[PDB]
């Protein structure tokens, strides 16, 4: 429903610093964690687009402070095939 | 009147794409519309001059079909007297903007709900169109009214509603997607009670 | 509004002529409009602000009476500043033009046979008048719309109809009956049938 | 529609003032026309996009509501782009200015104690209000039609009538309170029998 | 739980200038004001992060022309410890 | 509501003269007065927007000579959530 | 009650001035006039406090153009023994 | 109702030497004092006009022998509603 | 609740010695291991934040002679959302 916003880092100790960082800075919600091997692991948060953009820019920059940060976007809004077929925590 | 609608009927085939086309002439705007019901076959919304001395085109049909129209009045309309001043080609619009494109529509009422108000002109009508359709389809927001060309010569608006973050977001797609064709865009963040639902009157 | 008529009744007498001025002020129209009824008795059709802030004199009556009021009122309009911008002045105005001088006309539906179109814009409106005219008294053609400066801000378009070679002939009248106030004109000789009858909509 | 009589009911407060804004952009017309109805409680009459691309706000209250709302509204539009046009602030209009205001009234009778006429027109809608309110004030005319800025392209006429000597004395201050705006005035000293009380038609 | 926006100032016509603007200026919700002594004021509001975004930094705008800021600041989430500690508006 | 207008003064014996002038001086309504601490005093009066207008600058005239003034400003419409809740005298 | 607005003008002539353009600038009321000799006269109106300080401030700009203006002054709100000795128009 | 008087002395010393000049200058009623903070403390006089206009200038003339006067000031006639808001000593 | 300590090692060797350093150095417990694939493996140890803070910069000293340390970072206060939502010892 809300607004998604992700950070992928190269090493589970910077997206779980990132991962804090995001719902210590505004009110999001993060549904969990993905895993697509290789080292790279990708923390999802969920809340509305002030929130989350202003959550993942400061994980963004406490996540460069301990590894290698892949990338970082925020959607305003996705469509309802992304959550329908993503794991993107509002599967109906 | 009614192929202004969103979705078709099941006896009819779905045409989602849409073409837009403003011409300086309108004459080579009649040329440029039978040209492209020629090469491919695309149901012509309007051919309808507007103020400021132009002509606006608006087609419909399937994507490839709207594509090879638009192509063809790409190779129509920039022929000498280059009088396309700005073109668009829509794959999919979105389905809250097809009753806004015949007639200027005002809203009387909005909800009970809407927090934030953005009203966003630009000098063209195929920004207009653009960017009231990359704004609401990357934001929750309400398309409110709409004026194309008409009564306010050549300039076009439109108003979204929605929370102030979505409006916001939908003012930084908007803002991005005209850059230049952009006049002027007001993020009002609470309108007065004396002007919700009614600000054109 | 039955002054726009061809042929007056029996009990009226004949008013053939005809003179149109255009003037970028609209005080100084009213000055020249009751100038040109103080001189000469002419019947006056119409005094009406079109757009891009011009007014438009229509007026009617005899030869004589048609030519006097317009010298009047040409020598009142070029009195300091400019304010005269176009003008026109018919000894005998064709049939099938009279009903396309109040009212914006659009057409609605073509006859059977019929082959080739053409559209005529200008950039006053005595110009298309004045094209209108004479490619009429020209070719045998069919003159279907005619829009005289209201909503499209000053330029005025037309379209005749008929056979190819009719009106080629009538484009080859119209190009040096116009000059330099000939915007665009544009020879479909072929138009779709998803486009006959109805250019504008 | 009721909102732009002269006098108020008596289960209602009296609103002698007027305010009327006109725009370049019809964005910070909203952004203007609620900031000033955020700062004082002014009842707003009209914001109404007309031609020429630009925004037009009437505003109406007392004269201390509408001064304060006219200096917010004055500290909103000249916000680095000086998108305000033209302002005007009447701390008591005149009662035959009131119902010329909404919608474009044109007049078709007079009576047989008008000798002469005059046509006033500025180049916006404020120079227009404000000489209208001038003449009436200082000279017992009569004000019989009235466009503002709709379908003439931000120009702005009227029409006064009554005596030689004080429509000529409302000419005079209209020249003064105009200035630089007016574009061309014309003194109709005696009209002819087939004009009078039917000039736009 | 809400976002938090404050406004401090040195003077309470400037508290009343800036607690007008910012319910004026975005959908926030005014819920008092601190009164720390000397002088000081400090007007709070308290709502989504947009909202107390906007709403402050058109109130500081709003202050400064009537009297002495002394700080704005807005927190997108304050700890539960904080709003259980501090008399913010939304002490359970 | 009706119209707002303040006198803060440095200063009691300041912030009496100025509510006295301001009563003479117009019809308004002086509903009391706020005790920032520190010396400073601000008397808030209340009326529709002309009268007010011009009380306070009767005030800030005739406070000006016996006190400090530090500020003075007139909200002509203070906002429902600012009469609801700060004091000034027409909190329903 | 209602607002006191004067001109004094050393001329009749700028005082029909002044008290016409009073008038006609605002719905005013011009209760009379007096001549206290010596060629000065004075025109006054008497309404609300913004619509006399709009009407004095225009009969001003027109009074100086043709006479001598010696005074212009607005008072808000005249004491009831004002009105109850000096001739203002709204004498009991 | 009767007149009133006011000094305020940054200091309670020379605030209680001015409310003692004060009622042995004249016949005076000290109804009391008010403390603004900051050391700002105010005697309030309030008797009839020529008992408080001889009780304060004695009372600034014998309260800047010991002090810090911050400001005199003497209101013959207060108006009631600066004695139905103000705590003056005649609150009805 | 408690505070968090991760070790990331590119090799099971390099976080196998750094995770029998942690535990020696202080009183941590060595919840687990993570395994983001690709070579990554992060030991996890978790206690109060004087603990963590010298196992973890013991672990690092112990970890890099034997192997290639990624990253190394101390939470001394994770958010309920972060122990909620990753597996670090503490899921409800």
Same mark, same amino acid.
């Given at each position: 429903a809300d607004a998604l916003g992700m950070i992928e880092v190269r090493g589970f100790v910077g997206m779980v610093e990132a991962a804090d960082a995001? *719902?210590?800075?505004?009110? *999001?919600?993060?549904?969990?964690?993905?895993?697509?091997?290789?080292?790279?692991?990708?923390?999802?948060?969920?809340?509305?687009v002030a929130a989350v953009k202003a959550a993942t820019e400061a994980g963004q920059r406490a996540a460069e402070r301990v590894g290698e940060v892949v990338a970082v976007h925020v959607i305003p809004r996705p469509h309802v095939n992304v959550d329908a077929a993503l794991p993107l925590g509002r599967t109906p | 009147p009614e192929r202004f609608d969103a979705t078709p009927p099941a006896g009819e085939p779905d045409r989602p794409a849409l073409g837009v086309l403003e011409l300086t002439s309108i004459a080579r705007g009649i040329t440029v519309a039978d040209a492209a019901?020629? =090469?491919?076959?695309?149901?012509?919304?309007?051919?309808?001059?507007?103020?400021?001395?132009?002509?606006?085109?608006?087609? =419909?049909?399937?994507?490839? +079909?709207? +594509? +090879?129209?638009?192509?063809?009045?790409? +190779?129509?309309?920039?022929?000498?007297?280059?009088?396309?001043l700005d073109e668009l080609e829509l794959p999919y619009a979105h389905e809250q903007l097809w009753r806004f494109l015949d007639a200027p529509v005002v809203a009387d009422a909005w909800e009970e709900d809407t927090e934030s108000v953005i009203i966003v002109e630009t000098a063209t009508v195929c920004a207009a169109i653009d960017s009231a359709d990359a704004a609401l389809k990357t934001a929750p927001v309400v398309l409110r009214d709409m004026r194309l060309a008409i009564g306010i010569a050549g300039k076009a608006f439109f108003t979204l509603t929605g929370e102030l973050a979505d409006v916001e977001a939908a003012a930084e797609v908007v803002r991005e997607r005209c850059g230049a064709r952009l006049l002027e865009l007001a993020c009002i963040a609470r309108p007065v009670d004396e002007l919700r639902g009614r600000l054109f009157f």
């Amino acid at each position: 429903a809300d607004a998604l916003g992700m950070i992928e880092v190269r090493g589970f100790v910077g997206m779980v610093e990132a991962a804090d960082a995001m *719902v210590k800075a505004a009110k *999001v919600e993060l549904i969990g964690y993905e895993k697509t091997g290789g080292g790279y692991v990708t923390a999802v948060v969920r809340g509305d687009v002030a929130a989350v953009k202003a959550a993942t820019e400061a994980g963004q920059r406490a996540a460069e402070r301990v590894g290698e940060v892949v990338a970082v976007h925020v959607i305003p809004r996705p469509h309802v095939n992304v959550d329908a077929a993503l794991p993107l925590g509002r599967t109906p | 009147p009614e192929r202004f609608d969103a979705t078709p009927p099941a006896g009819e085939p779905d045409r989602p794409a849409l073409g837009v086309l403003e011409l300086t002439s309108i004459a080579r705007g009649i040329t440029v519309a039978d040209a492209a019901l020629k =090469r491919a076959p695309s149901l012509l919304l309007m051919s309808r001059p507007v103020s400021s001395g132009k002509h606006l085109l608006m087609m =419909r049909g399937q994507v490839a +079909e709207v +594509e +090879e129209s638009m192509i063809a009045a790409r +190779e129509i309309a920039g022929a000498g007297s280059g009088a396309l001043l700005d073109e668009l080609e829509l794959p999919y619009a979105h389905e809250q903007l097809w009753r806004f494109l015949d007639a200027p529509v005002v809203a009387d009422a909005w909800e009970e709900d809407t927090e934030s108000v953005i009203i966003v002109e630009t000098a063209t009508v195929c920004a207009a169109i653009d960017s009231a359709d990359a704004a609401l389809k990357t934001a929750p927001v309400v398309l409110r009214d709409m004026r194309l060309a008409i009564g306010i010569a050549g300039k076009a608006f439109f108003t979204l509603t929605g929370e102030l973050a979505d409006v916001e977001a939908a003012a930084e797609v908007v803002r991005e997607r005209c850059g230049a064709r952009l006049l002027e865009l007001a993020c009002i963040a609470r309108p007065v009670d004396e002007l919700r639902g009614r600000l054109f009157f």
